[PDB]
Design an enzyme around this catalytic site. Structure first.
Site, short mmCIF file in Angstrom:
data_model
loop_
_atom_site.label_atom_id
_atom_site.label_comp_id
_atom_site.label_asym_id
_atom_site.label_seq_id
_atom_site.Cartn_x
_atom_site.Cartn_y
_atom_site.Cartn_z
CB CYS A 149 -0.90 -0.01 1.24
SG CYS A 149 -1.89 1.49 1.50
CB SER A 168 -0.16 3.84 4.15
OG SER A 168 -1.34 4.51 3.75
CG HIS A 197 2.70 7.68 2.66
ND1 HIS A 197 3.14 8.19 1.47
CD2 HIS A 197 1.35 7.82 2.69
CE1 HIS A 197 2.08 8.59 0.76
NE2 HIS A 197 0.96 8.40 1.53
CG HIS A 206 -1.10 -1.16 6.47
ND1 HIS A 206 -0.02 -0.73 5.69
CD2 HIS A 206 -2.21 -0.65 5.84
CE1 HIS A 206 -0.50 0.05 4.70
NE2 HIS A 206 -1.83 0.13 4.73
CB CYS A 219 -5.19 -1.53 3.61
SG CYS A 219 -5.17 0.29 3.54
N1 LIG Z 1 -7.66 6.70 4.72
C1 LIG Z 1 -7.19 5.46 4.70
O1 LIG Z 1 -7.60 4.60 5.50
C2 LIG Z 1 -6.18 5.04 3.70
C3 LIG Z 1 -6.05 3.73 3.28
C4 LIG Z 1 -5.20 3.35 2.26
C5 LIG Z 1 -4.43 4.36 1.67
N2 LIG Z 1 -4.51 5.63 2.11
C6 LIG Z 1 -3.79 6.70 1.41
O2 LIG Z 1 -4.45 6.87 0.15
C7 LIG Z 1 -3.49 7.35 -0.84
C8 LIG Z 1 -3.55 6.49 -2.07
O3 LIG Z 1 -3.03 5.21 -1.76
P1 LIG Z 1 -2.78 4.18 -2.97
O4 LIG Z 1 -3.96 4.12 -3.88
O5 LIG Z 1 -2.20 2.95 -2.39
O6 LIG Z 1 -1.60 5.04 -3.72
P2 LIG Z 1 -1.04 5.07 -5.20
O7 LIG Z 1 -1.16 3.77 -5.84
O8 LIG Z 1 0.29 5.73 -5.09
O9 LIG Z 1 -2.05 6.01 -5.99
C9 LIG Z 1 -1.98 7.42 -5.95
C10 LIG Z 1 -2.32 7.99 -7.31
O10 LIG Z 1 -2.26 9.42 -7.22
C11 LIG Z 1 -1.77 9.90 -8.47
N3 LIG Z 1 -1.33 11.27 -8.25
C12 LIG Z 1 -0.13 11.68 -7.70
N4 LIG Z 1 -0.08 12.99 -7.69
C13 LIG Z 1 -1.22 13.46 -8.26
C14 LIG Z 1 -1.77 14.80 -8.63
N5 LIG Z 1 -1.06 15.84 -8.30
N6 LIG Z 1 -2.97 14.77 -9.14
C15 LIG Z 1 -3.71 13.67 -9.45
N7 LIG Z 1 -3.22 12.41 -9.26
C16 LIG Z 1 -2.01 12.37 -8.69
C17 LIG Z 1 -0.69 8.88 -8.84
O11 LIG Z 1 -0.31 8.99 -10.20
C18 LIG Z 1 -1.31 7.55 -8.40
O12 LIG Z 1 -1.91 6.87 -9.48
C19 LIG Z 1 -2.13 7.36 -0.12
O13 LIG Z 1 -1.87 8.67 0.44
C20 LIG Z 1 -2.35 6.41 1.04
O14 LIG Z 1 -1.45 6.64 2.12
C21 LIG Z 1 -5.37 5.98 3.07
O1 LIG Z 2 -3.14 2.87 4.36
C1 LIG Z 2 -3.76 2.96 5.63
C2 LIG Z 2 -3.12 4.00 6.55
C3 LIG Z 2 -3.70 5.21 6.90
F1 LIG Z 2 -4.87 5.56 6.37
C4 LIG Z 2 -3.10 6.11 7.74
F2 LIG Z 2 -3.71 7.23 8.05
C5 LIG Z 2 -1.94 5.73 8.31
F3 LIG Z 2 -1.37 6.59 9.17
C6 LIG Z 2 -1.31 4.60 8.01
F4 LIG Z 2 -0.12 4.26 8.57
C7 LIG Z 2 -1.91 3.70 7.14
F5 LIG Z 2 -1.28 2.55 6.87
ZN LIG Z 3 -3.07 1.12 3.48
#
Ligand SMILES: NC(=O)c1ccc[n+]([C@@H]2O[C@H](COP(=O)([O-])OP(=O)([O-])OC[C@H]3O[C@@H](n4cnc5c(N)[nH+]cnc54)[C@H](O)[C@@H]3O)[C@@H](O)[C@H]2O)c1
Ligand SMILES: OCc1c(F)c(F)c(F)c(F)c1F
Ligand SMILES: [Zn+2]
Ligand SMILES: NC(=O)c1ccc[n+]([C@@H]2O[C@H](COP(=O)([O-])OP(=O)([O-])OC[C@H]3O[C@@H](n4cnc5c(N)[nH+]cnc54)[C@H](O)[C@@H]3O)[C@@H](O)[C@H]2O)c1
Ligand SMILES: OCc1c(F)c(F)c(F)c(F)c1F
Ligand SMILES: [Zn+2]
Ligand SMILES: [Zn+2]
Ligand SMILES: [Zn+2]
Lengths: 374, 374
Positions: free
Chosen positions: B46, B48, B51, B67, B174
């Site tokens: 993922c 995250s 990150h 995770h 996730c």
């Molecule tokens: N809230 C939650 O529980 C939760 C859960 C899982 C992931 N996340 C977060 O969600 C985000 C996406 O995760 P993911 O899908 O695994 O990531 P990912 O696969 O990196 O997807 C992100 C997408 O954003 C695109 N992107 C980057 N910059 C820009 C821009 N400026 N404008 C438009 N598109 C752009 C990029 O090309 C990519 O396809 C990350 O920040 C994770 O940390 C949060």
């Molecule tokens: O991808 C899920 C995810 C989150 F949404 C967070 F906010 C975070 F802090 C983290 F560690 C995480 F794994």
């Molecule tokens: Zn995640």
């Protein structure tokens, strides 16, 4: 007889920011098609009117302000179907055109015909019905209620109960409906919940009324003016806190008091800092914060979006989320049926000629609502 | 044969930010009371997890990240009632203690026992089950799935169907659940609505799946990587836009395309600027914007609260708003019944030993989800 004729009457003209209103003769044109000319009976002094004076709100000057009012229809233009001469009415500072995507949406009220977002200070047709000393004078929100007579578009007026006491129900034109709806409609306060209300003026007291009506178990009033606390408790506050009494930031105090955050918080002041404090003091996973206040024009707040990622909901609304023309007549009927009170909001009743004294009462902290009588 | 004994196994240890994972032997202590030791079978990569590498997310180092995973219970500590040795399980990075005010709330999911808000990198008891080179190693979110064996608190594991394909259903831990729930549960996307989804990675594709399941009529994918568009359309996007193709800011483009703003928008990237853009592009009176993306540590966004005063709703959520332990087994059952698809998210499969190649694929833009097999 005035129908079809220019009326010369008294109004409160604001010629420039940060000056007193000038009480003087204006000319009020007759209503055009789909317009309504109203003899004003009572208008309240809302903090939003003061924002025009202070420059917190930018709107074309010179202007006839005033948006919280009630009056009697003097004449109607061609094509008006919803009011008649002699009807009691409330001007609607948020219109309800009935035709735009917002008016057709079950939960929208901010009609696209509004003159708030990008104010022109005119009638719907882009012209003014007011002159003063030979100069055109702007409208305000399509209402301009600080005048013995105004002209409004039909979409900006609602017919109300002929037996309505206009010196009370004018408050349904802004402050009561906004606060009450912010609680019952926008937040949807739940029975048994804990609420925090920032700002205990006319609108914040109406928020308290709504939280109490919705069955909140605890309603914490927050104000830096402790003289506001007694009335807040009378209308339902269970506790009051003054941030100035604490060494800690008040979001921390309110989080501690609510054993981990409030269910519902309301910003009813108009400050960027209190908007972020109010968000932060709601419970991080399921809290809801509603922005009601109006802050200084073109200023951005700063916040950490983790406040939202954990689960908080942040929203705002104009006029309590109420679809204005549908809701105002029902609110007046509910008032007539004793479903809520308005007298707790009214601290002062002055003749219209004392508008400046009324604004001074608001600015000094003395008043909640002053009602001006024509 | 290993119950009560330290297990030596391979894990991916992150000793330092901005460095490759080190695949090396760790010691995994047996479970203490109300703990569960899991033999991992599959784990997804993922963003995250990345990150943690990049320092976008701050958690104590050194750490065993991971995770999004599924495995088989190897042993249970004293007093465990909800899983048994040999059960298939998904670790829950958002716990569900069942006892706190959030767990008891009908709409809360961000249990107060989480290790996300203020990470300690420990078990619930404040200690670690991992040793490497004789040094204690942090946990991550109570899960630490980048290891052949992990130990989790009972409130951080769910029993799932014994016939589950673990190489697929790890995504329920996730990315799928997050995106799908953000649409169906947090936003509550309506039939016939217009949605905008910023970010077309595994989570954003899962948002699209949910918007389509909810009956949205239009689902506009937004990404700066046009290679993401084909798969977005396969799972339900009606059209895709690249902000880099436009002279005007994309919130203006999306407002125009939606004849005045979208019903629902989702930030699924993790940038402050796209969080504000996503809010702006939802209709000003009744639009809803959901923050999903993880913002960079300790940075504040800047916004004009007039965006909310008009009527917008802004919210965020962890894990799609799902109460984790109640929801994960149901989601697996629904997957087994073909109520949603996971294969569109899986672009690459690698052995665990090739974790670093898996991260390279994500960082290059090539992959959606790489699934690692132990
Ligand atoms: N809230 C939650 O529980 C939760 C859960 C899982 C992931 N996340 C977060 O969600 C985000 C996406 O995760 P993911 O899908 O695994 O990531 P990912 O696969 O990196 O997807 C992100 C997408 O954003 C695109 N992107 C980057 N910059 C820009 C821009 N400026 N404008 C438009 N598109 C752009 C990029 O090309 C990519 O396809 C990350 O920040 C994770 O940390 C949060
Ligand atoms: O991808 C899920 C995810 C989150 F949404 C967070 F906010 C975070 F802090 C983290 F560690 C995480 F794994
Ligand atoms: Zn995640
Ligand atoms: N959203 C809407 O439709 C709508 C409607 C009506 C009013 N408003 C706005 O709502 C706000 C309140 O209006 P009102 O009730 O007429 O004003 P008001 O009567 O001036 O009340 C404001 C209250 O805030 C208190 N206050 C000032 N600073 C602070 C602080 N730092 N901490 C806590 N309390 C403080 C102050 O003492 C007073 O009691 C104004 O910004 C109005 O412009 C919005
Ligand atoms: O008090 C109601 C009110 C508002 F809520 C505004 F946002 C505004 F700009 C204004 F002029 C006004 F009168
Ligand atoms: Zn309308
Ligand atoms: Zn007002
Ligand atoms: Zn809990």
């Amino acid at each position: 007889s005035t129908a079809g004729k220019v009326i010369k009457c008294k109004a409160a003209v604001l010629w420039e920011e940060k000056k007193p209103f000038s009480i003087e003769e204006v000319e009020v044109a007759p209503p055009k098609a789909h317009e309504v000319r109203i003899k004003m009976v009572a208008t309240g002094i809302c903090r939003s009117d003061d924002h025009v004076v202070s420059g917190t709100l930018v709107t074309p000057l010179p202007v006839i302000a005033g948006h919280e009012a009630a009056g009697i229809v003097e004449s109607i233009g061609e094509g008006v179907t919803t009011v008649r001469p002699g009807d009691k009415v409330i001007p609607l500072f948020t219109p309800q055109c009935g035709k735009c995507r917002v008016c057709k949406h079950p939960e929208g009220n901010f009609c696209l015909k509004n003159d708030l977002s990008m104010p022109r200070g005119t009638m719907q047709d882009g012209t003014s019905r007011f002159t003063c000393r030979g100069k055109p004078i702007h409208h305000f929100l399509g209402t301009s209620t600080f005048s013995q007579y105004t002209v409004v578009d039909e979409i900006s007026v609602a017919k109300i109960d002929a037996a309505s006491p206009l010196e009370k129900v004018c408050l349904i034109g802004c402050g009561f409906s906004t606060g009450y709806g912010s609680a019952v409609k926008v937040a949807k306060v739940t029975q048994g919940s804990t609420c925090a209300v920032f700002g205990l003026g006319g609108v914040g007291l109406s928020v308290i009324m709504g939280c109490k009506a919705a069955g909140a178990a605890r309603i914490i009033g927050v104000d830096i003016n402790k003289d506001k606390f007694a009335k807040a408790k009378e209308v339902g506050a269970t506790e009051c806190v003054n941030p100035q009494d604490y060494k800690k930031p008040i979001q921390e105090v309110l989080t501690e008091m609510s054993n981990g955050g409030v269910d519902f918080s309301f910003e009813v002041i108009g400050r960027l800092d209190t908007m972020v404090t109010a968000l932060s003091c709601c419970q991080e996973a399921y809290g809801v914060s509603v922005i009601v206040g109006v802050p200084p024009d073109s200023q951005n707040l700063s916040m950490n979006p983790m406040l939202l990622l954990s689960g908080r909901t942040w929203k705002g609304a104009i006029f309590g989320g109420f679809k204005s023309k549908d809701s105002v007549p029902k609110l007046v009927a509910d008032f007539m049926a004793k479903k809520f009170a308005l007298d707790p909001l009214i601290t002062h009743v002055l003749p219209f000629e004392k508008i400046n004294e009324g604004f001074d009462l608001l600015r000094s902290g003395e008043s909640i609502r002053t009602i001006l009588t024509f």
